Amino acid sequence: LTALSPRRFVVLLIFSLYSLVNAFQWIQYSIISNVFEGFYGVTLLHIDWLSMVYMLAYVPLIFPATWLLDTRGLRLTALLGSGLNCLGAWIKCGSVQQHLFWVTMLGQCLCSVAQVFILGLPSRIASVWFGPKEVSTACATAVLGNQLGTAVGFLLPPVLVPNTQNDTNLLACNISTMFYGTSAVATLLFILTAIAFKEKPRYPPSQAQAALQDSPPEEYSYKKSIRNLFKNIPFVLLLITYGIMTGAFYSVSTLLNQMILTYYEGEEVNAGRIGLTLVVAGMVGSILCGLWLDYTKTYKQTTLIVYILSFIGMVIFTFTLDLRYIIIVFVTGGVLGFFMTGYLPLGFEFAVEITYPESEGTSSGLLNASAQIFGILFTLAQGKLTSDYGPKAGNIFLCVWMFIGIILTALIKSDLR
């Protein structure tokens, strides 16, 4: 007896909404990083670390959290993901002062820990609550909810918080309003999670989950899985190319305010819409990419073409910022964003196919961990280059690294799909 419960829409909607808030909080500081420079009396390096602890905290905590999710259940991970997101947001609301940067540093640390319990959920929620035909779209919706958070995170903070650096009292009110609004939304979603997020439906929704429910997962071993994934060389190369592709997206998103503001002074609002275009277009590309793979070509050919086009994406983007035309940044940012974050569906689906005899829990974790490691290195490197030799030097650094990504992608041997 397998049936679909109406609660699955509520569970999916609740998770997508508090995934939006957590992803909103990752980029809310970086998009107005020039505002927080004068508010805290703090250099750009610390403000970049606000968006980078989202990546630093993910690397060590991903696998113990996956162990917690695979052993305790969906509800505890959901409660911890929303609970720490709500707790991290509430700490920030008390950090709106000129001498309390560590308080907002501590608050962002909790949100980064919350992301560990959020990013691994979308694949599990669809496979537990949704029937066989709707697993793919339910999984896609949850990830798009996280990407939609970045889109809102790019657009709203510039609107909510103007520069107003010559009036600190008025500046403090706007920052507190954004923090108060973020915590209030996160608190409501945590309350809903504690109420509506059931552990599992009354009956399994799919035939595969009914069979899988009878098998205890205590026989799994994470040490064997990670060690076995580095033995085969095709996956190691893909772990690097995906990290470069996704890490470049994190580096650009974190430093988008710095590159835009030096050429266009006072256009921090427009930098938000460029960030929105850079990721909304990727959402369109991600949807189109999913319908693209099983319609014309194979995984290897498609992932090389997108990577080649993604490299061309910033080559035009690198050499169009200096043109001093704001319209050109919108189009080039969208074209670059159509392929930068349109590759993540390609990265995940390519890896899971070439890793059949190994569980997708670790392969997905390693790919995300690879993105965090490269995102930290790129932001640290591009941040110094931009702050010293101009944004063109910083962007060329990313262009060089995708050239390595194209070469490494071409060396992968695969024929699946």
Author numbering: 100 to 516
From the paper:
Human feline leukaemia virus subgroup C receptor-related proteins 1 and 2 (FLVCR1 and FLVCR2) are members of the major facilitator superfamily. Here, we show that FLVCR1 and FLVCR2 facilitate the transport of choline and ethanolamine across the plasma membrane, using a concentration-driven substrate translocation process. Fully conserved tryptophan and tyrosine residues form the binding pocket of both transporters and confer selectivity for choline and ethanolamine through cation–π interactions. Our findings indicate that both FLVCR1 and FLVCR2 operate as uniporters, facilitating downhill ligand transport independent of sodium or pH gradients.
We determined structures of FLVCR1 and FLVCR2 in as-isolated (without exogenous addition of ligands), inward-facing conformations at 2.9 Å resolution. The inward-facing conformations of FLVCR1 and FLVCR2 exhibit a close resemblance to each other, with a root mean square deviation (Cα r.m.s.d.) of 0.993 Å. Both structures feature a wedge-shaped solvent-accessible cavity that is mainly created by the separation of TM4 and TM5 of the N domain from TM10 and TM11 of the C domain. Although FLVCR1 exhibits a similar extracellular hydrogen-bonding network as FLVCR2, it lacks a corresponding salt bridge interaction. Of note, although the as-isolated, inward-facing and outward-facing conformations of FLVCR2 represent apo states of the transporter, we observed an extra non-protein density within the substrate-binding cleft of the as-isolated FLVCR1 structure. Introducing choline and ethanolamine to FLVCR1 leads to displacement of this unidentified molecule, evident from the altered size and shape of the specific densities for choline and ethanolamine in the respective electron microscopy maps. It is, however, conceivable that FLVCR1 is copurified with a blend of choline and ethanolamine, creating an indistinct density for these ligands or alternatively with a yet-unidentified ligand.
